RNA sequence: CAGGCCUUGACAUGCUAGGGAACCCGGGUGAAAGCCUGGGGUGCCCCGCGAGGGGAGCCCUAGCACAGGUGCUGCAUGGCCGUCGUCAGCUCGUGCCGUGAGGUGUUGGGUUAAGUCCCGCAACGAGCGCAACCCCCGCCGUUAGUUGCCAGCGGUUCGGCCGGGCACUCUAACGGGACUGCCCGCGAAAGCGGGAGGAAGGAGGGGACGACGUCUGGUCAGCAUGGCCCUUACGGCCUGGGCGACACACGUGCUACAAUGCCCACUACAAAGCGAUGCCACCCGGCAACGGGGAGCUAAUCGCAAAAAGGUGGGCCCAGUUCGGAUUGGGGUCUGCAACCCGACCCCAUGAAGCCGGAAUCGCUAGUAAUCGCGGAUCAGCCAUGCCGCGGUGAAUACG
RNA sequence: UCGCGGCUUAAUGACCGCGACCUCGCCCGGUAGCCCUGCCGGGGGCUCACCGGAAGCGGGGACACA
């Protein structure tokens, strides 16, 4: 949008947890209008969580989102001559989107073959610190903060 | 690629269908054939009387062919015999009881299908074109109407480049549904081509 | 007797009849979770009664109709609320922090010529 | 397709049955390509019509359950 | 070739597959409607004039 | 019992042709059911608007057959007197059937 | 998928009926 | 396009005129058209028990004007439309200024979707635009109930099927409702930021709507039409072919490349529709397409009809595979006189390319994208994956 | 509806003053259809839709159920 503020679509609260992070994760899992299969995948994923680790069905996921949550992310700005790749800090209302989208991409590329166990082995390794999603976070926080030299463009 | 037809834009509201009858899929095409052929008889052969519209109805085998004429003196006849022969003509192409009700207009300049025909008669009578336009709008305003606009399309004045001339006095609110802008269109079939006279007459609103 | 309510959403309609009843609900001569059998968002329909916190008093016979499953579920989500509002002054001012009485008339919007799904324009040559 | 008909013509059938009268000539100029090769009535070369001219297909027993229009190919560049 | 074909649409003493319907006011052989019998162009210029009962500009 | 069925196009003449009939069969004897407006039948059809090369951005029209029925419940000769004789629609097909 | 003519969804896409998509 | 043919002709008449006058039945040649050809032979105008004769529709022959042209020209045109663009503009009357073209109004700051409005102003107003009046979709009400629901004793083919009946959902008319309406903050005012109530918010969401005109835009091939050209052919009829060809290139889509996936079974859940020479329920037969009976429907009453995705629990197990379904062979069913060029399906073989795609590029800001089916149109069948609609599930993001 | 003067106008207006009038009856005459005991032909009903002759016309411009 260009004119107005373009306020965000208010989500739903989830059913079994009553949380708002989990519904955005349902949405990022959801492929081609299939939410009844996507949230099904997530609840099988927390079932695999309760099977493997003696933790809450939500705590490992929320801590995975926090431990994949970026702060400094790099955005391109053409400033004449060579388009610089300026770092900037991120609003948490975009950090949540970047975090959940990275979780879904790394979980779908993750070399397990079944739906909810990919997310299981991804949320375990992201809450630990050794997953593909937190690898991508460290990748972008090493693109920025080493690309800090052009940070004087706040735009 | 603009300006949709201001009868059919109104048509649901503020304006009647000019032919109103009914039947389903069985006899709609078959009614429409005779409903077009009656008009092809009339509009070709009643033009001297200057017919505006042919309101065609049928409840059950009672074809009301009520026409709207400025001067019924050559669509009725002296005491009435052209009406008789025209009803025996209307019996020839549909066998039904073709009750032909000629009905005169209340001012023959507030009716756009006859103002546009009058401009077409002027063009085919080789008159001055924009003089005819700025005269026809002025005759409409002296008859008394809220606003007029006579668009006359190309090949105008015997030329080769084909510009479109037009003139207005008053307001012609086309985009307003409640406006009741009557609309008339008439070809002009002179030597230098087809001059397409249009005329909008903004009657009383609402 | 009947704590009746209407309900409709997305061309899925609902006639809810809240009973004075112990603990269950039903739908259209079928069981509730044998109508909505195995939807992860099935029990998002009953979310009025779990938030007017009056769930431990009401049965709900329901004739729900039309649309699809999760459209009928939101029809019920409106229906329970608009039903128990009706015999009540103070089960009313609860849903404005919940949204639970608004038809939410986001309907499947009308397909436009040239496009395919009322917004999806065709692909573009530009060449 | 077409299990309820012999789908042969009222003039090609007459001509091949009249030309099978104890053995006869060979010229039969047809225009109707649609008719089949008349089964158990093979042998006489038929001049089928792809449009430009009449191609004289000599019909054989390996081509019996086909149509006559297969043997008037209608285009160049095979 | 259209004054031939607007009468070839009338006459059929041959096979009954060749009874393609042709338009009534004009002589168009495409988009002729199994309703009215006008083609799409004659349908548009009669529905806008108002010579078809019941027809109306649609918006649903 | 018996129904009379009113098809047609303009509802503004159809309701003034049907509520008249409800009033007439009321005035001509015993009671009769009101106008039951069973759903209209919309024949839609689309038209490429320009004559030649305008396939996108076309127009489409609709054709709304308005059906309305009235259930005559006690058909006396007094009812058929002011009903079957006094038939006045204007463009409305009335048909009387069991 | 759907261009196949010998399955359930491949027959429901073509619309017709068969051994793979029967009539009740 | 090829070939067979017909000539005032498929046609619109109108004239001179021996003839037949309304018209039916074939035979032969033939691919058909066409051409050649034989048997029945007209109420009426009529004077008629008369011979009959003038002579009225229609029809064939010899001619005539002419018909005909999908022949050319959309820079000769109408009509209609796409387009800039649903963009916020384009002007005029009068006054002023300027020798004049032309300003001014329409600038300025504010403001919105907007030339929308207000405050200042040589401007004061007005016209087409915008907005609104129209319709759908939203909520509520009145009327109305051969759709609809158990509230009712209660039958019970034990079924919305009825017996009781319309409560509702609905249907489609008529109404109401939303207007900054309220209140606060800012503001010169317009209005903006927020709140409350409401179903809804600040154009509630979508339609239809598209100004002065441009592109000498497109269409003489939808029609109408000026002009020129063909008039035993550029017209007309038919048979057959082509419009489908293919070395390649492009555009738009469809399916794919899979395990969130695929296959089989079973059970749900829509709106929009459309049907008397049609839709075909329900049987029987055939694995099946379909075939033979035949119910109902003149259709909120019967039918297409299955909904699909979903869900259920069984398979597959990361495999060019139970992914894929292109191809080719075979067996067939329907339509149609006719499926070979070239139809659709059915079945059985076949199982390829393709393992997410170069440089580039497109679509989308809410029921939208995405995915899923359904209907309709034209229509015998159908090229449909297209188009036009309908709903099911239903996102992410918009910092700027 | 048409002549002649003008209103009104640009030809021409819509409008006035007379005139060629008209049709409808108040003025007259005939024809012809039914409502029926099913099939026609002989008495009433009067309807001029149809048409000829009309003193002024009451009127409007060229029309019509019982
Ligand atoms: Mg550089
Ligand atoms: Mg966000
Ligand atoms: Mg000349
Ligand atoms: Mg959709
Ligand atoms: Mg066809
Ligand atoms: Mg497969
Ligand atoms: Mg079933
Ligand atoms: Mg001759
Ligand atoms: Mg030229
Ligand atoms: Mg043009
Ligand atoms: Mg100006
Ligand atoms: Mg001066
Ligand atoms: Mg304005
Ligand atoms: Mg709104
Ligand atoms: Mg050009
Ligand atoms: Mg021309
Ligand atoms: Mg051309
Ligand atoms: Mg034409
Ligand atoms: Mg030809
Ligand atoms: Mg083609
Ligand atoms: Mg594609
Ligand atoms: Mg599949
Ligand atoms: Mg249909
Ligand atoms: Mg059968
Ligand atoms: Mg129906
Ligand atoms: Mg229905
Ligand atoms: Mg095959
Ligand atoms: Mg790709
Ligand atoms: Mg690149
Ligand atoms: Mg469809
Ligand atoms: Mg096609
Ligand atoms: Zn047409």
Tell me what you see in this structure.
Chain B: One of its GO terms (cellular component) is cytosolic small ribosomal subunit. Chain B: Belongs to the universal ribosomal protein uS3 family. Chain B: It holds the Pfam family KH_2. Chain B: Residues 38-106 form the KH type-2 domain. Chain B: Binds the lower part of the 30S subunit head. Binds mRNA in the 70S ribosome, positioning it for translation. Chain F: Pfam families: Ribosomal_S10. This is part of a larger assembly, with 7 protein chains of 7 kinds. Chain B has 206 residues and is an alpha/beta fold. Chain B folds into 2 domains: 16-106, 2-Layer Sandwich (GMP Synthetase, Chain A, domain 3), CATH 3.30.300; 107-206, 2-Layer Sandwich (Ribosomal protein S3 C-terminal domain), CATH 3.30.1140.32. Chain B has helices at 29-45, 82-93, 112-124, 129-143, and strands spanning 19-20, 51-54, 56-58, 62-64, 67-69, 97-99, 102-104, 147-149, 168-170, 181-186, 197-202. In chain B, the strands form 3 sheets. Chain B has a 4-stranded mixed sheet. Chain B has a 4-stranded antiparallel sheet with strand order 9-8-11-10. Chain B has a 3-stranded mixed sheet with strand order 2-5-7. In chain B, helix 3 runs antiparallel to helix 4. Chain C is an alpha+beta fold. Chain C contains 2 helices and 6 strands; from the N terminus they run E-E-E-E-E-H-E-H. In chain C, the strands form 2 sheets. In chain C, strands 1, 2, 3 and 6 form a 4-stranded antiparallel sheet that branches. A two-stranded antiparallel sheet of chain C has the order 4-5. The longest helix of chain C is centred in the middle third of the chain and has 16 residues, at 69-84. The radius of gyration of chain C is 18 Å and the shape is elongated. Chain D has one helix spanning 12-19, and strands at 28-29, 46-49, 54-57. In chain D, a hairpin with a 4-residue loop joins strand 2 and strand 3. The longest helix of chain D is centred in the first third of the chain and has 8 residues, at 12-19. The N and C termini of chain D lie far apart (26 Å). Chain D has a single domain, classed as Ribosomal protein S19/S15 (30s Ribosomal Protein S19, Chain A, 2-Layer Sandwich), CATH 3.30.860. Chain G is an all-alpha fold. Chain G has 1 helix and no strands. Chain B binds chain E through residues 4-5, 7-9, 11-12, 15-22, 25, 28-29, 32-33, 35-36, 39, and chain E through 24-25, 34-38, 46-54, 56-57. Strand 1 (55-57) of chain E pairs antiparallel with strand 3 (59-65) of chain F, so a sheet runs across the interface. The site of one magnesium ion has 4 residues of chain A, from helix 4. The structure holds 2 RNA strands.
